[PDB]
Design an enzyme around this catalytic site. Structure first.
Site, PDB file in Angstrom:
ATOM      1  N   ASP A 179       0.822  -1.213   0.000  1.00  0.00           N
ATOM      2  CA  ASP A 179       0.000   0.000   0.000  1.00  0.00           C
ATOM      3  C   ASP A 179       0.858   1.266   0.000  1.00  0.00           C
ATOM      4  O   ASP A 179       0.503   2.258  -0.648  1.00  0.00           O
ATOM      5  CB  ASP A 179      -0.929   0.034   1.231  1.00  0.00           C
ATOM      6  CG  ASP A 179      -2.309  -0.604   1.001  1.00  0.00           C
ATOM      7  OD1 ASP A 179      -2.563  -1.297  -0.001  1.00  0.00           O
ATOM      8  OD2 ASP A 179      -3.178  -0.407   1.886  1.00  0.00           O
TER       9      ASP A 179
ATOM     10  N   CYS B  98      -2.482   0.720 -13.514  1.00  0.00           N
ATOM     11  CA  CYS B  98      -2.515   0.720 -12.053  1.00  0.00           C
ATOM     12  C   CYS B  98      -3.674   1.634 -11.659  1.00  0.00           C
ATOM     13  O   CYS B  98      -4.735   1.548 -12.279  1.00  0.00           O
ATOM     14  CB  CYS B  98      -1.150   1.119 -11.479  1.00  0.00           C
ATOM     15  SG  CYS B  98      -0.332   2.589 -12.210  1.00  0.00           S
TER      16      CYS B  98
ATOM     17  N   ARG C 242       3.448   2.614 -10.949  1.00  0.00           N
ATOM     18  CA  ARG C 242       3.742   1.186 -11.140  1.00  0.00           C
ATOM     19  C   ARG C 242       3.747   0.805 -12.620  1.00  0.00           C
ATOM     20  O   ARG C 242       4.591   0.008 -13.063  1.00  0.00           O
ATOM     21  CB  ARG C 242       2.723   0.326 -10.398  1.00  0.00           C
ATOM     22  CG  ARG C 242       2.735   0.548  -8.896  1.00  0.00           C
ATOM     23  CD  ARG C 242       1.593  -0.168  -8.197  1.00  0.00           C
ATOM     24  NE  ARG C 242       1.335   0.448  -6.897  1.00  0.00           N
ATOM     25  CZ  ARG C 242       0.369   0.069  -6.067  1.00  0.00           C
ATOM     26  NH1 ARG C 242      -0.450  -0.907  -6.417  1.00  0.00           N
ATOM     27  NH2 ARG C 242       0.216   0.689  -4.894  1.00  0.00           N
ATOM     28  N   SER C 243       2.795   1.329 -13.387  1.00  0.00           N
ATOM     29  CA  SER C 243       2.730   1.019 -14.824  1.00  0.00           C
ATOM     30  C   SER C 243       4.006   1.439 -15.539  1.00  0.00           C
ATOM     31  O   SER C 243       4.515   0.719 -16.419  1.00  0.00           O
ATOM     32  CB  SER C 243       1.522   1.716 -15.464  1.00  0.00           C
ATOM     33  OG  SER C 243       0.268   1.174 -15.029  1.00  0.00           O
TER      34      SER C 243
END
Ligand code: JKY
Length: 282
Positions: free
Chosen positions: A181, A215, A221-222
């Site tokens: 998270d 994401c 993240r992508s």
């Protein structure tokens, strides 16, 4: 400089924030006028993340062709990716319309539906075989065929049917379920294992349309996923693998979508992933 020793030099000098801010300063700025039209407000998850006009994916519709998605075309590596936000309640039908029209084989998901107690994207695929989904606005049907749950990720086989023509296609859903998270993973080992599973499926290969990767905003993240993949491919293709400059590759990708890699911690994690991945390839 080479990568692994540039890496230790930034760690010892504690200058990751300064390196990352240089990237932000040098990054391209192109117009995103279509994204900001009033009729598209409920098609964007975040007001400060928009596709550039020159690289946006167009839906094959005459009413409104807009989706928050960008084509990243990497010429030397010979790879293409579509990066997009997590679908919203009013864009799940547009999302699958794009997958159909662009001839993608795979969808890569790097977030959980709920994180930090809030919804990060819509539940856009079916969870039980016998409970299929119909998207009436775009005339598509989606069925869960099989599901394989592993410790760090899940792979699903899905059937997408164009109800207008009765054509069907098999789509692979690659879901990385263990990104924390807060922060980034401590080791890149499970992320690299996941990348290799996507590769082995054919989803990144030229005989299919571009992979769709998301994401929540489709930039953090992508961005880490496509940056690591392209850097490792270039290290295999070139006579001198130490010539691959991860900062230059990232700036090239930022010509096609704003904001890729959202924090200095994500930048450091991308270096770590490429460094460890280059040892396993050989
Ligand atoms: C968001 S925008 O499209 O209105 N501005 C981008 C921009 C970048 C660079 C120059 Cl020289 C001019 C404009």
């Amino acid at each position: 400089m080479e990568m692994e020793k540039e890496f230790e030099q930034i760690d010892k000098s504690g200058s990751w924030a300064a390196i990352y801010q240089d990237i932000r300063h040098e990054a391209s700025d192109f117009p995103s006028r279509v994204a900001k039209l009033p009729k598209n407000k409920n098609r964007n998850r975040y007001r400060d993340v928009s596709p550039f006009d020159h690289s946006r994916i167009k839906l094959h519709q005459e009413d409104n062709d807009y989706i928050n998605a960008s084509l990243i075309k990497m010429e030397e590596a010979q790879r293409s990716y579509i990066l997009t936000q997590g679908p919203l309640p009013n864009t799940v039908g547009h999302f699958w319309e794009m997958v159909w029209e662009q001839k993608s084989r795979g969808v890569v998901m790097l977030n959980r539906v709920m994180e930090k107690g809030s919804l990060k994207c819509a539940q856009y695929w079916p969870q039980k075989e016998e409970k299929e989904m119909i998207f009436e606005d775009t005339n598509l049907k989606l069925t869960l065929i099989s599901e394989d749950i592993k410790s760090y990720y899940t792979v699903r086989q899905l059937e997408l049917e164009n109800l207008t023509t009765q054509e069907t296609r098999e789509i692979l859903h690659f879901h990385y379920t263990t990104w924390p998270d807060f922060g980034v993973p401590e080791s890149p080992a499970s992320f690299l294992n996941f990348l290799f599973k996507v590769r082995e499926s054919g989803s990144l290969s030229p005989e299919h349309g571009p992979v769709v990767v998301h994401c929540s905003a489709g930039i953090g993240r992508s961005g880490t996923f496509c940056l690591a993949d392209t850097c490792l491919l270039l290290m295999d293709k070139r006579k001198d693998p130490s010539s691959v400059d991860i900062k230059k590759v990232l700036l090239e990708m930022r010509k096609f979508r704003m904001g890729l890699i959202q924090t200095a911690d994500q930048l450091r994690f991308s270096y770590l992933a490429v460094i460890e991945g280059a040892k396993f390839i050989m």
